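I am sending you the entry underneath: sequence plus fold tokens. Let me know what the token row says about the fold:
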Amino acid sequence: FEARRPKAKAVISEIDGVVRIEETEEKLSVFVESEGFSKEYKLPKEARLLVKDGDYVEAGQPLTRGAIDPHQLLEAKGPEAVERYLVEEIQKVYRAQGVKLHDKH
């Protein structure tokens, strides 16, 4: 409800394109690119990656595993996405606990 930076953040994809990953020792890196451009993403050691070398990632899609920051998803996929994310991500907790409250609220 209070838009905040979860500790375990998940770097979303500002760009909607295709995936590419790298090997070097210290830090991993996922690159999203379209015929237009590509964007480099720094995914440190702990970041377990959900995406694989090969397919498409819509804007604001999870590229790291876990929590997302509403502001970023706002920027990336739009209000329509933050909004829709907030609701469903909230009901996630209640549903898991038995409470059945209508999304409306």
